[PDB]
Design a protein around this ligand. Structure first.
Ligand SMILES: CCCCCCCCCCCCCCCCCC(=O)OC[C@H](COP(=O)([O-])OCC(O)COP(=O)([O-])OC[C@@H](COC(=O)CCCCCCCCCCCCCCCCC)OC(=O)CCCCCCCCCCCCCCCCC)OC(=O)CCCCCCCCCCCCCCCCC
Ligand SMILES: CCCCCCCCCCCCCC(=O)SCCNC(=O)CCNC(=O)[C@@H](O)C(C)(C)COP(=O)(O)O
Ligand code: SF4
Ligand code: SF4
Ligand code: FES
Ligand SMILES: [Zn+2]
Lengths: 115, 151, 89, 205, 206, 52, 117, 91, 104
C-alpha cells in the first residue's frame, strides 16, 4: 500500500545501489589486507568469490530500508575488518568451514535422519 | 529570529549538504509489505523449512479458568527430540521449538509473520459463543424428560 | 564385576549386548544397596483404636505434612507420604 | 493502620502531577500523553520525532533540570504496530526527582540520538542497537557493544530464541574456534506458568 | 425477545431475561469463581463459591442459578462479595487433607488457584492439633479412576454427569451432613464409555 | 516492567560502571599508560553488571 | 570579599556574576520575544526570568542573591541561564507550540499488551 | 590464655605501630558459642486469628492503572511554577 | 588506621593518585555519573539521604564529598564511606526491634 516513514541514509533506490557498490569496492580493497593479516587458510580469489556469494544471496531484496540496513551492517563488518577487532575464528564463519554439508535428495534425507 | 550567534555547521555547509539534511528529515513513500528475513539474523534453513502456527492456546480441561485462553500466540513446528546416550535427557537441535509469542489478534500475528518472512498458517479461528439458557426450574419439571434424578 | 549386571530399585540394568556397558570398564557402577521397598515392608503395621489417625512422619516439623487416614475399611492403610501402615482391629 | 500495605507519598504525587501537567502544557506538539504510575513515577509518552528536543527541554528548563540520564531501556512488544518502545530515565538533582520519557520505534524507523543532549547515551543507544536493532541517526559511533563480532541478529528481540541459533567449539583440523548449529545436550524445559484465574480486577479495563 | 439492562460491576449490559448473573458476568468479561457450575451440566447451589452482592438485598445471591431482572446493579469486586467468598472457601478448606505434593491435580487444581485468587492467606483452623479434620474411606469405583475421597468437596459434578450425560446412575450421594460421601454404596465398578471425563469434571482431583 | 503474569516482561539493570567506562574515553585521554591503569581502578567497574 | 572556592571542580569563581546573569536574562528575553504569545512556554519563561532578573537587580551581595534565588550558588545560576538561553534559541526552530506531529497508533500504549479486548 | 608473642616483642610492635595494638585475630573466648538454645521467632502483626481479613490487607489489589493527568484535570475542572519536587542545593 | 598509615600519607601514592584523572562536575552530570564519581567531584549527592529507603532515615551518618576530582579524593571518599558504614553498623547494632523477619 502506502506509508510515510523516516528514511535511513537514502531517499530512493539509486542512492542505496550506490551505497551497496561502495560496500563492494571497500570490501574488495579490504580483502587483500584481510588475507595477509588474519592467518586464515583462504586464498584472495576464494575470499572475493565468497564476497560475491554474500552479495548474491542478498540481491533478491527490493525494499530500500532493508537494503540500507544491510549497507549499515556491511559497513559495521568492514569497520570490524579495517581495525582487526576480531580473530581468525570469526572471519572463517562466512565460509562455514566446520559444518559438513547435508544432501538435498529425498532418498539420502530419508536414509540419514528426519530433518 | 534571534539575533544571537548562528550555528556554524549549517551556515558554512555546502548547498548539497543542506539538500542532504532536508531530504532525510522528510517522509518517503514505502510499501507496507516489508520482508525482514535478511535483517533478523535467522539462518535461511529455518526460513525455508519451519512452519509457524498461529493459534489460540487450548483450555486445560481439568480447570474452569479461561484467563490463559484470552490471548493468541505464535508457535513453531515440533522437530525431532532424542535421548542423549550418556545420561538420558531430551536433547533437541531445534532452537525455535521453545518460543511462544503472544499477540492480540490473528491479523497482528499474520502481519508479523509477513514481516519476518515465516511460512504462517492459522490452526483455528475465534470461537463463537452459543447462547445456552441455564436456570434452576428445568431440573424439576412436569411431563418433561429433563427432570433430574440426583439431589 | 557384579555391579555392572546389578539391578537398581527402579528395575534398570544394561544388557550384555549394549554399548553403554563400555563406560564401566574404568568407573564402577553405583547401585544403592538400601532399597526403600524392603525397608518399608520390614516396618510392622501399627494397630490403632480410633476411626481416623494422624501421621506427621514421626518427627514433628521435620516429617511430612500431617495427614489423616481413615481406618473403617478393613485391611492395611498406607500413608502416601512415608509408607507407614496402619490397621484397626 | 495497615502495616502490610505500602504507604505512598502525597506531596510527591502532587509535585509530579503539577510538573506533568506543566510538561504537557509546555510541549503540545511532541508530548503525546502524560501519566503518573503507581509508586510516584511520571511517564511522559512522546512522539518519536520529539525524542531529541523534549529531553533537551528536560535538560535546560529552569523547572526541568534533569541533568543525569541514568539509563535508556528498550522493551520489545511484538503485538504493537510500532514494535519496540524506548524508555529514557532521567534524574534531577536540583529538584530531587526522576522522570521517564517513553517513545515507540519500528524495526526500521530511526530515532534521533540524544548524544547532543546527554553523552551517556553515547553507549546506551549502542546497547539498544545491539539488543534490539533500532538505528540511531546522527550517532558518533554506532557499533555492536555487547555481542560477538560475528554475531548475526539481535538477542533481546522476542523473535530471537533464548539459546540463540549457533554454538561455538574448538576444532583441530582447522586449529580454530568454530561455529556450529545449536544442539542442546538437554533442552530448555519450558514451564507453563500462565495464570488460569485472573487476580487483579482493576487491570481489565 | 427483548433485552433487559443490568449494571454488572457498574457496567451496563443488555441480556436475555433467562440468563443468570454469571452468564451476564461472562458476557462483560469478568470470571466469577465456581466449583460446581459446569455449562454442560445442570445448575446447582452446593459449592456456594459464586456468591455476589446485588444492591438493596439483605443476603448475597448465588450467581450461577439466580436469574437477573431489570434494574439490578451487581458488584463483583465489592467488599461483601470478597468476604463471602473468603468465608465460604475457608469452610471448603477447613477439612481438605494436606495432600498437595501427592495430588496429581495439583498445579492445575481449582482450589489452589482459587485460594491464590479470591482466597485467604492463612488458615483459621485452630483444631488441627486436637480433634482434627475428617478422613473417609476410598471406594473402588473403577480401574480407570483412582479415588481418594478425603479430597472430595461434595460439588456433585460427577453424579450430575452420570445421571445426565453418561446415562447410568451408579454414582450417588451417601450419608448426611459432614460425613456425606460422594460414592457408590457398594463395591461396584462405574463403567461408561465416558468415565475419563469424570477426571475432567472433578475440580479438586479426588 | 511486568505484564501481570508470573514472569517479568522486561528487567533492565542500570550499571553504575557503564557511564564511568563511557567517560573513560575522555578522562583517560592525554595520560600515561600507568595513569590509564590507575584511572580504570578509580572508576569502580566490575564488568558483570556492565555486560549484564 | 570573594569566594575562595565553590567546593565543586570544573567551575571557577565568577568576577562579575551580576552582569553575566543580567546579560543572559536579557538574551533570554530577546529569544523569547520572537515566540508567539499563545505559547505557554513563552509565558512561563518570561515569568521565570523576570522573577530572576528582579532577584538579581534587587540584591547586590552575592550570597544574599544566592539565598534570595534559593536555587543554588551563583555559578550554577549562570550555568542554568546559559542552558535556558540555548533552549530558547533551539525552540524557535523546533516549533513546539503547534499540534501533535503524530497521532496515537492503535494499541500503542496498552498494558498488558497481549489481550484480545 | 591467648597465643601471642612475649611482651618484649609486643612492646616493640606497639612502638613500631605508633598506637596501642588490639589483636586482629579472633579467639574462642571473644566469640559466642557455636551451640545456642533453640529460638522462637515471634509472630507478626497479622497472625492474630480473630480480627484480620485479607480484603483489608491485600496490597496487590489496591494498585490501579496509571492516571492520565490531562484527563484527570479535565474531569476535575469541569503563584509559583510547578517543580518536580523540593529544591535541593547540591552546590 | 594501619592501612591508612601505610597508604594515605605516602609520597608515591600521592604522586600516583593526585591531579590524575580529573573529571569536572558538568562532565560528570552530562555523562550520567553516579555515586563516588559524583561525590569525588564536589557534587553533594548521596541516594541514601536524598531519597531514603529501607530505614536509612532512622540512622544518622555523614556523606563524604571530594574537592579536586582526582584519584586521591575518591580514595579518601571511599575510606570515609567505610568509616561512616562502620557508624551505621554501630547504630543498627545499637537498636533493632523484636518481631517478624518477612511480610505476612
Ligand atoms: C626487633 C628484633 C627483636 C629480636 C628479639 C630477639 C630475642 C627474643 C627472641 O629471639 O624471641 C624469640 C624466641 C622466643 O620468643 P617468642 O617469640 O615469645 O616465642 C615464640 C612463641 O611465643 C611461642 O608460642 P607457643 O606457645 O605457640 O609456642 C609453640 C612453639 C611452636 O613450635 C613451632 O612452631 C615448631 C616449628 C618450629 C621449630 C622446629 C624445630 C627447631 C629446632 C630443631 O613455639 C616454639 O617452638 C617457639 C620457639 C622457637 C625456637 C626456634 C625455632 C627454630 C629457629 C631456627 C633458626 C634459628 O626465642 C628464640 O627463638 C631464641 C631464644 C634465645 C636463644 C636460645 C635458643 C636458640
Ligand atoms: C573476506 C571475507 C568476505 C566477507 C564477505 C561478507 C561481506 C558482507 C556482505 C554484505 O554486506 S551482505 C549485504 C549487501 N547488501 C546488498 O546486497 C543490498 C542489496 N543488493 C542489491 O540490491 C544488488 O542488486 C547490487 C548489490 C545492487 C547488485 O545489483 P546490480 O545488478 O545493480
Ligand atoms: S485437592 Fe487441590 S488443594 Fe487439595 S490436596 Fe489436591 S491439589 Fe491440594
Ligand atoms: S468426587 Fe469430584 S466431581 Fe464428584 S462431588 Fe466430589 S469433588 Fe465433585
Ligand atoms: S457455582 Fe454457584 S453455587 Fe456453585
Ligand atoms: Zn506418614
Amino acid at each position: 500500500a502506502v506509508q510515510q516513514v523516516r528514511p535511513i541514509l537514502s531517499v530512493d533506490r539509486e542512492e542505496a545501489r550506490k551505497r551497496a557498490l561502495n560496500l563492494y569496492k571497500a570490501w574488495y580493497r579490504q580483502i587483500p589486507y584481510i588475507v595477509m593479516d588474519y592467518d586464515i587458510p583462504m586464498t584472495v580469489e576464494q575470499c572475493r568469490d565468497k564476497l560475491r556469494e554474500e552479495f548474491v544471496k542478498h540481491r533478491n531484496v527490493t525494499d530500500i530500508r532493508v537494503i540500507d540496513m544491510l549497507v549499515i551492517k556491511g559497513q559495521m563488518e568492514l569497520k570490524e575488518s579495517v581495525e582487526i577487532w576480531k580473530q581468525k575464528g570469526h572471519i572463517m564463519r562466512y565460509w562455514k568451514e566446520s559444518q559438513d554439508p547435508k544432501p538435498t535428495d529425498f532418498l539420502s534425507k530419508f536414509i540419514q535422519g528426519v530433518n | 529570529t534571534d539575533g544571537g550567534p548562528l550555528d556554524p555547521k549549517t551556515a558554512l555547509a555546502r548547498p548539497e549538504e543542506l539538500e542532504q539534511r532536508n531530504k532525510l528529515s522528510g517522509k518517503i513513500t514505502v510499501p507496507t509489505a516489508v520482508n525482514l528475513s535478511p535483517i533478523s539474523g535467522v539462518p535461511e534453513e529455518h526460513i525455508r523449512e519451519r512452519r509457524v502456527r498461529i493459534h489460540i492456546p487450548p483450555k486445560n480441561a481439568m480447570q474452569s479458568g479461561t484467563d490463559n485462553v484470552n490471548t493468541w500466540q505464535i508457535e513453531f513446528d515440533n522437530r525431532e527430540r532424542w535421548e542423549n546416550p550418556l545420561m538420558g535427557w531430551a536433547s533437541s537441535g531445534d532452537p525455535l521449538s521453545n518460543m511462544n509469542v503472544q499477540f492480540g489478534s490473528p491479523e497482528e500475528a499474520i502481519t508479523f509473520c509477513e514481516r519476518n518472512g515465516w511460512r504462517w498458517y492459522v490452526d483455528g479461528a475465534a470461537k463463537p459463543k452459543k447462547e445456552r439458557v441455564k436456570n434452576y426450574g428445568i431440573n424439576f419439571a412436569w411431563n418433561k424428560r429433563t427432570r433430574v434424578s440426583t439431589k | 564385576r557384579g555391579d555392572i549386571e546389578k539391578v537398581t530399585h527402579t528395575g534398570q540394568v544394561f544388557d550384555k549386548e549394549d554399548y553403554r556397558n563400555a563406560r564401566f570398564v574404568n568407573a564402577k557402577r553405583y547401585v544403592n544397596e538400601n532399597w526403600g521397598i524392603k525397608l518399608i515392608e520390614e516396618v510392622p503395621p501399627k494397630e490403632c483404636t480410633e476411626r481416623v489417625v494422624f501421621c506427621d512422619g514421626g518427627d514433628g516439623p521435620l516429617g511430612h505434612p500431617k495427614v489423616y487416614i481413615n481406618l473403617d475399611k478393613p485391611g492395611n492403610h498406607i500413608c502416601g507420604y512415608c509408607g507407614l501402615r496402619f490397621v484397626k482391629k | 493502620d495497615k502495616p502490610t500495605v505500602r504507604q505512598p507519598d502525597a506531596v510527591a504525587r502532587s509535585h509530579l502531577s503539577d510538573f506533568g501537567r506543566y510538561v504537557a502544557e509546555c510541549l503540545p506538539k511532541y508530548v503525546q500523553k502524560v501519566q503518573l504510575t503507581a509508586g510516584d513515577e511520571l511517564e511522559v509518552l512522546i512522539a518519536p520525532e520529539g525524542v531529541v528536543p523534549v529531553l533537551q527541554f528536560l535538560k535546560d528548563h529552569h523547572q526541568a533540570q534533569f541533568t543525569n540520564l541514568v539509563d535508556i531501556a528498550g522493551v520489545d512488544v511484538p503485538c504493537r504496530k510500532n514494535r519496540f518502545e524506548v524508555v529514557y530515565n532521567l534524574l534531577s538533582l536540583r529538584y530531587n526527582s526522576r522522570i521517564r520519557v517513553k517513545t515507540y520505534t519500528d524495526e526500521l524507523t530511526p530515532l534521533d540520538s540524544a548524544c547532543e543532549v546527554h553523552k551517556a547515551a553515547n553507549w546506551y543507544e549502542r546497547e539498544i542497537w545491539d539488543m534490539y536493532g533500532v538505528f540511531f541517526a546522527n550517532h558518533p559511533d554506532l557499533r555492536r557493544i555487547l555481542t560477538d563480532y560475528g554475531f548475526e541478529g539481535h538477542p533481546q528481540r522476542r523473535d530471537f530464541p533464548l539459546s540463540g541459533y549457533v554454538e561455538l567449539r574448538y576444532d583441530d583440523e582447522k586449529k580454530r574456534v568454530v561455529c556450529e548449529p545449536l544442539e542442546l545436550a538437554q533442552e530448555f524445559r519450558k514451564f507453563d506458568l500462565s495464570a488460569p484465574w485472573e487476580q487483579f480486577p482493576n487491570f481489565r479495563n | 425477545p427483548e433485552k433487559i439492562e443490568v449494571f454488572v460491576d457498574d457496567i451496563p449490559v443488555q441480556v436475555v431475561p433467562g440468563t443468570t448473573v454469571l452468564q451476564a458476568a461472562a458476557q462483560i468479561g469478568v470470571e466469577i469463581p465456581r466449583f460446581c457450575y459446569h455449562e454442560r451440566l445442570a445448575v446447582a447451589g452446593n459449592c456456594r463459591m459464586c456468591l455476589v452482592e446485588v444492591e438493596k438485598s439483605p443476603k448475597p445471591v448465588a450467581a450461577c442459578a439466580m436469574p437477573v431482572m431489570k434494574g439490578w446493579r451487581i458488584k463483583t469486586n465489592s467488599d461483601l462479595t470478597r468476604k463471602a467468598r473468603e468465608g465460604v472457601m475457608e469452610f471448603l478448606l477447613m477439612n481438605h487433607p494436606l495432600d498437595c505434593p501427592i495430588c496429581d491435580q495439583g498445579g492445575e487444581c481449582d482450589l489452589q488457584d482459587q485460594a491464590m485468587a479470591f482466597g485467604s492467606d492463612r488458615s483459621r483452623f485452630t483444631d488441627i492439633n486436637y480433634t482434627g479434620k475428617r478422613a473417609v474411606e476410598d471406594k473402588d469405583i473403577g480401574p480407570l479412576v483412582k479415588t481418594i475421597m478425603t479430597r472430595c468437596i461434595h460439588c456433585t459434578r460427577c453424579v450430575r454427569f452420570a445421571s445426565e450425560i453418561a446415562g447410568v446412575d451408579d454414582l450417588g450421594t451417601t450419608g448426611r451432613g459432614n460425613d456425606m460421601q460422594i460414592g457408590t454404596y457398594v463395591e461396584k465398578l462405574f463403567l461408561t464409555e465416558l468415565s475419563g471425563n469424570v477426571i475432567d469434571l472433578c475440580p479438586v482431583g479426588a | 516492567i511486568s505484564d501481570g503474569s508470573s514472569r517479568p516482561y522486561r528487567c533492565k539493570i542500570k550499571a553504575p560502571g557503564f557511564a564511568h567506562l563511557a567517560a573513560l574515553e575522555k578522562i583517560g585521554k592525554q595520560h600515561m599508560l600507568a595513569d590509564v591503569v590507575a584511572i580504570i581502578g578509580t572508576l569502580d567497574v566490575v564488568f558483570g553488571e556492565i555486560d549484564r | 570579599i570573594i569566594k575562595a572556592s565553590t567546593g565543586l571542580t570544573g567551575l571557577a569563581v565568577s568576577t562579575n556574576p551580576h552582569h553575566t546573569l543580567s546579560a543572559l536574562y536579557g538574551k533570554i528575553l530577546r529569544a523569547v520575544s520572537k515566540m508567539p504569545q499563545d505559547a505557554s512556554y513563552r509565558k512561563y519563561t518570561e515569568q521565570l526570568v523576570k522573577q530572576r532578573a528582579d532577584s538579581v537587580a534587587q540584591h547586590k551581595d552575592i550570597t544574599a542573591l544566592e539565598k534570595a534565588v534559593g536555587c543554588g550558588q551563583v555559578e550554577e545560576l549562570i550555568v542554568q541561564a546559559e542552558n535556558e538561553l540555548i533552549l530558547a534559541r533551539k525552540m524557535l526552530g523546533w516549533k513546539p507550540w503547534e499540534k501533535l506531529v503524530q497521532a496515537a497508533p492503535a494499541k500503542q500504549w496498552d498494558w498488558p499488551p497481549a489481550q484480545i479486548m | 590464655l591467648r597465643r601471642d608473642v612475649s611482651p618484649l616483642i609486643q612492646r616493640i610492635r606497639a612502638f613500631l605501630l605508633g598506637r596501642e595494638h588490639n589483636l586482629a585475630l579472633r579467639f574462642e573466648d571473644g566469640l559466642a558459642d557455636r551451640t545456642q538454645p533453640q529460638p522462637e521467632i515471634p509472630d507478626g502483626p497479622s497472625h492474630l486469628l480473630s480480627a484480620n481479613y485479607y480484603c483489608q490487607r491485600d496490597g496487590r489489589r489496591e494498585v490501579l492503572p496509571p492516571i492520565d493527568l490531562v484527563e484527570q484535570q479535565k474531569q476535575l475542572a469541569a503563584s509559583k511554577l510547578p517543580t518536580p519536587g523540593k529544591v535541593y542545593a547540591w552546590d | 588506621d594501619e592501612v591508612e598509615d601505610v597508604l594515605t600519607t605516602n609520597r608515591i601514592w600521592v604522586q600516583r593518585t593526585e591531579d590524575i584523572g580529573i573529571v569536572t562536575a558538568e562532565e560528570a552530570l552530562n555523562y550520567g555519573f553516579s555515586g563516588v564519581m559524583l561525590r569525588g567531584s564536589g557534587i553533594k549527592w548521596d541516594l541514601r539521604k536524598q531519597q531514603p529507603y529501607d530505614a536509612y532515615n532512622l540512622v544518622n551518618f555523614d556523606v563524604p564529598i571530594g574537592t579536586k576530582g582526582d584519584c586521591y579524593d575518591r580514595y579518601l571518599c571511599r575510606v570515609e564511606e567505610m568509616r561512616q558504614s562502620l557508624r551505621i553498623i554501630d547504630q543498627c547494632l545499637n537498636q533493632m526491634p523484636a518481631g517478624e523477619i518477612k511480610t505476612d
